[PDB]
Design an enzyme around this catalytic site. Structure first.
Site, mmCIF file in Angstrom:
data_model
loop_
_atom_site.group_PDB
_atom_site.id
_atom_site.type_symbol
_atom_site.label_atom_id
_atom_site.label_comp_id
_atom_site.label_asym_id
_atom_site.label_seq_id
_atom_site.Cartn_x
_atom_site.Cartn_y
_atom_site.Cartn_z
ATOM 1 N N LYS A 1 0.906 -1.146 0.000
ATOM 2 C CA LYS A 1 0.000 0.000 0.000
ATOM 3 C C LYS A 1 0.960 1.214 0.000
ATOM 4 C CE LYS A 1 0.714 2.220 3.330
ATOM 5 N NZ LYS A 1 1.786 2.355 4.371
ATOM 6 N N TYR B 1 -4.943 4.066 6.551
ATOM 7 C CA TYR B 1 -5.345 3.076 7.554
ATOM 8 C C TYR B 1 -6.684 3.447 8.127
ATOM 9 C CZ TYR B 1 -0.875 0.944 7.617
ATOM 10 O OH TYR B 1 0.268 0.306 7.265
HETATM 11 N N1 LIG Z 1 1.784 -2.189 4.952
HETATM 12 C C1 LIG Z 1 2.505 -1.519 5.856
HETATM 13 O O1 LIG Z 1 2.337 -1.619 7.070
HETATM 14 C C2 LIG Z 1 3.711 -0.737 5.372
HETATM 15 C C3 LIG Z 1 3.965 -0.502 4.042
HETATM 16 N N2 LIG Z 1 5.057 0.178 3.647
HETATM 17 C C4 LIG Z 1 5.049 0.359 2.222
HETATM 18 O O2 LIG Z 1 6.221 -0.335 1.816
HETATM 19 C C5 LIG Z 1 6.956 0.462 0.886
HETATM 20 C C6 LIG Z 1 8.397 0.654 1.300
HETATM 21 O O3 LIG Z 1 8.492 1.432 2.453
HETATM 22 P P1 LIG Z 1 9.711 1.439 3.291
HETATM 23 O O4 LIG Z 1 10.075 0.046 3.687
HETATM 24 O O5 LIG Z 1 9.552 2.426 4.382
HETATM 25 O O6 LIG Z 1 10.797 2.132 2.263
HETATM 26 P P2 LIG Z 1 12.301 2.002 2.376
HETATM 27 O O7 LIG Z 1 12.607 3.333 1.814
HETATM 28 O O8 LIG Z 1 12.913 1.615 3.677
HETATM 29 O O9 LIG Z 1 12.560 0.913 1.385
HETATM 30 C C7 LIG Z 1 12.367 1.038 -0.022
HETATM 31 C C8 LIG Z 1 13.391 0.189 -0.761
HETATM 32 O O10 LIG Z 1 13.051 0.189 -2.161
HETATM 33 C C9 LIG Z 1 14.225 0.203 -2.937
HETATM 34 N N3 LIG Z 1 14.281 1.383 -3.790
HETATM 35 C C10 LIG Z 1 14.417 1.198 -5.141
HETATM 36 N N4 LIG Z 1 14.470 2.307 -5.849
HETATM 37 C C11 LIG Z 1 14.360 3.302 -4.901
HETATM 38 C C12 LIG Z 1 14.357 4.721 -4.987
HETATM 39 N N5 LIG Z 1 14.466 5.431 -6.114
HETATM 40 N N6 LIG Z 1 14.239 5.403 -3.828
HETATM 41 C C13 LIG Z 1 14.141 4.726 -2.671
HETATM 42 N N7 LIG Z 1 14.141 3.408 -2.466
HETATM 43 C C14 LIG Z 1 14.250 2.744 -3.626
HETATM 44 C C15 LIG Z 1 15.420 0.106 -2.011
HETATM 45 O O11 LIG Z 1 15.853 -1.250 -1.873
HETATM 46 P P3 LIG Z 1 17.279 -1.665 -2.123
HETATM 47 O O12 LIG Z 1 18.258 -0.728 -1.476
HETATM 48 O O13 LIG Z 1 17.448 -3.045 -1.604
HETATM 49 O O14 LIG Z 1 17.560 -1.590 -3.579
HETATM 50 C C16 LIG Z 1 14.844 0.660 -0.719
HETATM 51 O O15 LIG Z 1 15.512 0.090 0.375
HETATM 52 C C17 LIG Z 1 6.114 1.714 0.656
HETATM 53 O O16 LIG Z 1 5.230 1.490 -0.403
HETATM 54 C C18 LIG Z 1 5.297 1.832 1.927
HETATM 55 O O17 LIG Z 1 4.122 2.599 1.790
HETATM 56 C C19 LIG Z 1 5.924 0.654 4.563
HETATM 57 C C20 LIG Z 1 5.731 0.463 5.925
HETATM 58 C C21 LIG Z 1 4.579 -0.234 6.336
#
Ligand SMILES: NC(=O)C1=CN([C@@H]2O[C@H](COP(=O)(O)OP(=O)(O)OC[C@H]3O[C@@H](n4cnc5c(N)ncnc54)[C@H](OP(=O)(O)O)[C@@H]3O)[C@@H](O)[C@H]2O)C=CC1
Ligand SMILES: NC(=O)C1=CN([C@@H]2O[C@H](COP(=O)(O)OP(=O)(O)OC[C@H]3O[C@@H](n4cnc5c(N)ncnc54)[C@H](OP(=O)(O)O)[C@@H]3O)[C@@H](O)[C@H]2O)C=CC1
Ligand SMILES: NC(=O)C1=CN([C@@H]2O[C@H](COP(=O)(O)OP(=O)(O)OC[C@H]3O[C@@H](n4cnc5c(N)ncnc54)[C@H](OP(=O)(O)O)[C@@H]3O)[C@@H](O)[C@H]2O)C=CC1
Ligand SMILES: NC(=O)C1=CN([C@@H]2O[C@H](COP(=O)(O)OP(=O)(O)OC[C@H]3O[C@@H](n4cnc5c(N)ncnc54)[C@H](OP(=O)(O)O)[C@@H]3O)[C@@H](O)[C@H]2O)C=CC1
Lengths: 381, 381, 381, 381
Positions: B129, B217
């Protein structure tokens, strides 16, 4: 006015990003290998699923007397089928150098034998509470550990539980003031149709009734909350004579203890009433309530004074400490790797068993029993 | 008088015993293989550790743009290093038949591209989401899924959470009476030094501020608690102009909705105040309070009437349902294996995004926006 | 070793002992005399029984339009039958010098007339919320008070309630940090068979629906918790058109306000859902929850942060402050005797009425209404 | 569509309206006249202010050994100065026919003498707990009452408290299942500088330490919650020998009881630790927690089962029953007027005193004491 540098530097294209912030305990390695002994209720519901949250421990082998069950569990947990042992071939784990420790999750009376056998196989031993069914057996286990130059840890999960450690911390920081009264209550309804409870009705296997099984939480808990040992003990027990569950072991027992500091405690255990895990410590400045006190999950503590109730429990989004199961498992691993002593050693397990026997004697004679025998808790409570 | 047969038949010697009583969800298989896309905050703290509690799912591969990080994580989770992919070689997962589904845990704007790419690789897609940052992209993802004959599930963890399901159940059983007022509040302090939050300050990546991230949420929750969709929406937003975090996205926003049943709701999201996850549903017979409502852990629900507060939360010794993370993971697996539909499909994810856009429009214009577009929730709330 | 002097000096024979320790508010005098106007629901259940706990106030007279009822009530409360008045002979209280003040507990539209009439009779006036049904009438009442050189106090009981004052104190001591979000909800099911509610369905008597009657707690509360006034207001209202209770007045209404500090609030009132009195204030350091917030009895406040909930409510054996009813009554008495100003004066009552009218306008037009008119709260919140 | 008849029939002009709906207990008369004996701590803080909430009782006279104090209190409470008596002229209340009953709020050892003297004066007697300091004195009081043909009621306020009655009701309705364990704890820090506590340190006046003063709540409470009497009792007591407060009386004492039903109880009282009033009843179906159990205000009860906690306490806007003080006062009045028996008679007060003496004997000897003496609770618990 403008965006910050780190926000502005993020690409709109797919790119690798850094290691994220941990808000929970992350895995490190699986360097400590365990052999799980006894594939029962506690093992399958709590222990085996608790390995996933460990940072240094792994399940290496399984020892069981049910082959079909063992084959299923090994498959579920990714254990090599060649690493499944039985009670007769148990000693052949000495040939496996990938097995560092043994976790004995057998019934009480079989604890000593397998601990000793594991010490002769050159392994470290994590043994479940209660330590053994006799004081001499506890001593034998300790002697065997010493002789093997291995570590012996008793499975007191509450010594690795965050809420229980929080409670100890605030008591130690003088938040309740001078302690004078402790009240514990631990109970659950004994069901004889459950196979895990079948050996618990047998005196030869269990070594005692409710005090041995669940009253020990209230007993061990009183000692760690007060940070001292009892010098005197008094008790009474009753079980309904027509109840078929309590022919050999006790249903309900109430015990009172006196501490050198002046503090008193009153506690009880029951096999015939529902889920109760409630601890209360009274000081002159405040009162602490732990309900649930020793649960697997959802423990809650509350500090009360007039007009106030300050509560603590685990947070809703973060996990600042690991769970009691994983932490206990990792504790023995960490003590072995870092050459430090164990927080719940065999002498601590021996102390509870000795006190339980004293409580049983006091209930039997109806007289008070002196327990001022000079036990010193190594490394604190 | 005498002991029962099963207690008396237990040997005092080491013997194999049966399969114990489960008081917690046990593992079955690891038949569904997942490829995790994006090794960030949610992935490393919640998702990856949630796999252990699954009964049918396994981590098969990792897709990441940080090679060093990916190599560490693979080692931590036992993934083959040959199964680590990057964003350029992503499409080569189509050659691996052990990868059944793909879980996209990337930033919002990159959701559609990778979902579509995974559909072209013949995989099922679990997407986080909010679904996408545009309604058209949500539609594109749905079309692609349909064309590939694969399943699309949105990561709405609250649809698989026990306390949230309990709340829905009692509302459906008429315990509050006729519903008239819903109040939601979801907030947490936005930290720009955290890398996970850096893309959240960027409009091009996030697609909106607090409503997109955490207000959703309260929005999704209102719909499932009421069991209906809004026909009208009104909103206001404010962010302090000197705050550097809110240059492109919104800090605080308040929205009001009207439902066909007559029910009203008022809710808000915030990036500048602490941890709040509180839902309240008012009926004419009772009032339900959910605080915490949508936590990772420790959710609690309470039904209040004058002189009474009946609370529910998870039990202290048993675990009657699995956790929201493991259950969500296993849900897609089970729908694929059993040929049943998914509870949180793409149309449900599309609905929230469409409503969010409507809320943003209403806040921008200052006028009410009609949202009576005939969305029907397939399979219920 | 030995007993203390005071314990040892106590006679074993019946003897007079000193004045005991007060753990509750004791009576002083009955020097301030009140004339109670309108023997209805609030008067008979809350006000009249609240006089007993006053330290300086007494019931001197009764003014009622039901003679039989008045004769019964006078007998119940020990009032002289010669001191019972009716609405026509009301002005003859000017001849009685034992009547210091008048408490008007009439329906909203009749508040101004009797207040003014009491000011012409040379009495102080305690008037119930809401002040009047128009802004001009509020002004007329203020002018009349000024001209008579008498005090005008509005019956805002929450300004004299211990839990509400506790909440204000901690907010003022910076325990929540920088405030950004306030949420209020006040509701109760409107029963037309109750005589007290019959005038509440009539627009000419009540002056508005739920906002006028109970939404005002959330409105007044938001202002005192924040310690500031709103500069902008927005609202929506809905009532089911087939419901016979809401023909002239509103059932449900939701309002949003913006404060100069940057803080926002969202609140609602309802005549069709059960007992809700819930306030929530969000800061960046902590969140305060008041549930029940504005009850007659049993109010409870809670400060929450992750892993903690610190609660306060009245103590079980002591009563450190007096109740809201008795304290309100004694407040006017004390201000008159000590020549100090009143905490809930007519200007404060006028401000709520002006804001309510603004909220009603914003709901009617669907546009935001500026309320930045320079009201300054005299003597603080 | 249209307004209801009663709403439409309300005049816009000042008019008399009916008797309103009671949501709280209203006054009836002041037909029962009381003479208050002993103007101390309990009398001035709880009793004297509790008269206002009575529906049938009134304060007629005061008996005190401090003339200046009595003159002040009489003025505060509107008592005739001619109706103030002292301990020597006490018997002259027999000449006053407006005094129906006497309430003795003296120290424990002086209870019997004044009760007996009041019986000879032809008055009904309300006597405070504990009844007397000896079993024989309790018997003498009963005999005197019987001979005078007057009623004797002991001041057990918890028998008239709504939360305590609620608890009894649900236990009686089988909500906990078969009862097996009761745990009580009652404590408060003894302050020797307080004049009310000065006689409590003296054995000759008090008749015992903490058990006599506050342990009796846990003792009386156990009996009413179980609905039965103990057949066996065991106890231990300890007080620090250097503490000057506990030279003549006990600080801490722990007692265990066995009931004919099979139920057990463990309880304690303390003079050296803070405010604790906690009762717990364990059944096989559920567990009841009362904390606070026997407060003056704010009592709360909770029924717990795994995953649930159902709580009850007084409502926020209504008062469905009267308070314990006013109800106790009105109880004796109602029994006299309606010719019914008293719920807390002298035999009930005698039973607690007899059990306390048995508990003191068991603590002194260290042996169990049989208490199976055939007491039957008249009129139920
Ligand atoms: N359902 C829920 O409870 C939750 C959902 N989320 C959803 O999960 C998703 C990720 O959130 P979150 O874990 O906080 O994000 P993070 O920023 O911690 O993680 C995103 C990851 O995506 C990859 N990535 C690839 N391209 C990009 C870019 N251009 N900029 C940034 N990151 C990039 C990276 O992985 P890598 O370095 O390995 O390449 C990065 O670590 C979102 O959609 C959020 O809304 C988040 C928290 C809770
Ligand atoms: N720390 C804590 O919180 C808890 C500790 N425990 C402790 O763990 C231990 C095991 O308890 P629990 O899991 O309930 O017991 P179970 O009865 O469920 O399991 C015991 C297992 O030991 C093996 N076993 C070997 N010989 C025998 C025998 N003669 N009789 C019975 N079982 C035998 C069996 O394994 P297999 O069939 O594979 O051969 C059996 O499954 C006890 O010491 C208990 O006190 C229990 C619960 C909680
Ligand atoms: N601060 C607070 O917590 C509360 C404040 N109130 C305020 O107190 C006031 C009274 O409310 P409430 O007690 O519910 O009202 P009720 O309707 O129960 O009482 C109003 C009384 O006013 C008199 N009255 C005179 N003329 C009229 C008329 N034309 N129509 C109706 N009554 C008339 C009557 O007294 P009589 O028959 O003796 O002549 C009647 O009993 C309102 O302003 C309300 O907002 C109410 C509840 C709480
Ligand atoms: N049911 C309950 O909840 C409670 C019951 N009590 C019971 O009420 C009784 C009084 O307690 P409490 O109010 O604390 O006691 P206090 O000591 O405050 O009051 C006792 C009063 O009795 C009179 N008195 C007469 N002779 C003596 C004497 N020799 N020594 C001391 N006082 C004397 C005095 O009245 P004066 O100066 O006017 O002559 C004195 O003020 C006790 O029996 C106690 O157990 C107390 C608290 C609660």
């Amino acid at each position: 006015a403008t965006l910050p540098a780190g926000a502005s530097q993020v690409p709109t294209t797919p790119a690798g990003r850094p290691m994220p912030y941990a808000i929970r305990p992350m895995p490190e390695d699986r360097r400590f290998g365990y052999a799980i002994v006894g594939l029962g209720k506690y093992a399958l519901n709590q222990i085996l699923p608790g390995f996933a949250g460990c940072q240094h421990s792994r399940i290496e082998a399984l020892v069981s007397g049910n082959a079909e069950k063992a084959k299923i569990v090994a498959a579920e947990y990714g254990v090599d089928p060649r690493k499944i042992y039985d009670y007769s071939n148990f000693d052949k784990i000495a040939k496996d150098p990938k097995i560092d420790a043994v976790y004995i999750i057998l019934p009480n009376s079989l604890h000593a034998e397998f601990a000793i056998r594991a010490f002769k196989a050159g392994k470290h031993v994590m043994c479940e509470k209660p330590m053994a069914t006799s004081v001499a057996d506890c001593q034998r286990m300790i002697d065997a550990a010493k002789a093997a130059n291995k570590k012996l840890m008793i499975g007191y999960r509450c010594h690795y539980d965050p809420m229980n450690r929080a409670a100890v911390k605030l008591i130690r920081e003088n938040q309740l003031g001078k302690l004078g009264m402790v009240t514990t209550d631990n109970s659950d309804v004994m069901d004889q149709n459950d196979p895990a409870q079948q050996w618990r009705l047998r005196r030869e296997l269990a070594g005692g009734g409710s005090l041995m099984d669940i009253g020990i939480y209230g007993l061990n808990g009183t000692r760690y909350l007060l940070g001292e040992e009892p010098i005197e003990v008094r008790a009474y027990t009753y079980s309904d004579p027509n109840d078929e569950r309590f022919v050999e072991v006790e249903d309900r027992i109430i015990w009172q203890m006196r501490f050198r500091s002046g503090a008193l405690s009153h506690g009880a255990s029951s096999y015939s009433t529902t889920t109760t895990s409630r601890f209360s410590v009274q000081g002159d400045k405040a009162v602490l309530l732990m309900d649930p006190a020793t649960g697997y999950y959802q423990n809650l503590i509350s500090v009360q004074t007039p007009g106030h109730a300050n509560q603590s429990m685990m947070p809703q989004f973060i996990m600042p400490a690991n769970n009691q199961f994983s932490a206990q498992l990792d504790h023995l691993a960490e003590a072995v790797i870092n050459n430090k002593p164990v927080r719940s050693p065999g002498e601590e397990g021996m102390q509870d068993v000795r006190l339980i026997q004293a409580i049983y004697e006091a209930a039997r004679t109806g007289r008070p029993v002196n327990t001022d025998w000079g036990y010193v808790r190594q490394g604190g409570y």
